[PDB]
């Protein structure tokens, strides 16, 4: 697997091995993020697994993952749902197309992403693949962004960002609808 | 180290070395767990280090252990804190006295335990074991359990527990 370097503007210049690329130096790359509700219009919150490199044990969104070379960001989180999740989608809303954010976990690994946002509907049951996710939790909205506003340190930092953004926070709310 | 074994009534039967007593099927035994508060009246948060036999990477109160044979509650809690937080505090408080729990943890690693529940505030600075303790926060207690009432799932579950008892939450609002 790879990641797509871009520059200054996002523009890409070519791809670079996933794991030699995050580092404590990682430059700049594509990404993409998602937060998936179910009919019932709850919000599946994930736990990372202790394996992964970055922000392993952490509580966070749905879904994140790295489009690659011919795959559209679409097509990505399509992919990285089934792969992560074992699960079926609508087809993915964006919900925050700017999203870019540079961070350092715990151990110093380093994020450096254009992370354009999408919200979506599962349509099948879940098959968790634990060398991805170790927890997970379907939830209220409100309550997690209740959770997020007292004790925003104990989530993922770009769970944070993307939830406080006012109009990516409004599609999210637009997908607690209960749909048949 | 050991953890003591406890027959139906909490009597003491027999110890096991830590590592070995925590599986699938962990054995009920003693511990205790501590809310530490600063001089300024925040809460202590830690982040168990990743390299925890249970519930690692899990965020929790400050400080919880095993007391060993013949050790008092309030001098393990003591030890801990000097052990993994290399901090000091003032003796021990009360503060659940009967709770005791079982629970399994995503990789299935059990805790169950009878486990007596104290505060106290530091009187030191801390320095941290990376060992026991991978990331922390001092912050207000209010905010803690207005995040433990909205996602209790992203705390430990006898974190959660804890602050959930209504006498526990009236004693940890009183260190502020
Ligand atoms: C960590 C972010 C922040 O959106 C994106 C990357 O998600 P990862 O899950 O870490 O990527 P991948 O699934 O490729 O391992
Ligand atoms: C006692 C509980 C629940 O408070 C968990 C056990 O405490 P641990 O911190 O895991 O024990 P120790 O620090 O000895 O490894
Ligand atoms: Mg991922
Ligand atoms: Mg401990
Ligand atoms: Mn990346
Ligand atoms: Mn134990």
Redesign the interface.
């Known amino acids: 697997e790879h990641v797509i370097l871009l520059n200054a503007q996002g523009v890409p210049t070519g791809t670079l091995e996933k794991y030699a690329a995050h580092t404590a130096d990682t430059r700049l790359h594509l990404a993409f993020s998602s937060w998936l509700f179910n009919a019932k219009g709850q919000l599946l919150?994930t736990?990372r697994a202790?394996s992964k490199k970055a922000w392993?044990?952490?509580?966070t969104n749905s879904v994140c993952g790295h489009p690659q070379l011919g795959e559209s960001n679409e097509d990505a989180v399509i992919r990285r749902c089934r792969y992560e999740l074992g699960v079926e989608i609508t087809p993915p809303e964006s919900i925050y197309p700017d999203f870019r954010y540079r961070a350092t976990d715990?151990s110093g690994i380093v994020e450096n992403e254009v992370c354009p946002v999408f919200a979506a509907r599962t349509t099948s049951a879940l098959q968790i693949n634990d060398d991805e996710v170790?927890?997970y939790?379907w939830?209220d909205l409100a309550?997690?962004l209740?959770?997020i506003?007292?004790?925003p340190?104990?989530?993922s930092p770009w769970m944070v960002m993307q939830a406080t953004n006012r109009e990516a926070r409004k599609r999210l709310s637009a997908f607690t609808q209960l749909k048949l």
């Open positions: 919150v736990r202790l392993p044990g952490v509580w715990p170790m927890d939790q939830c309550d997690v209740h959770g506003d007292a004790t340190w104990a989530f």
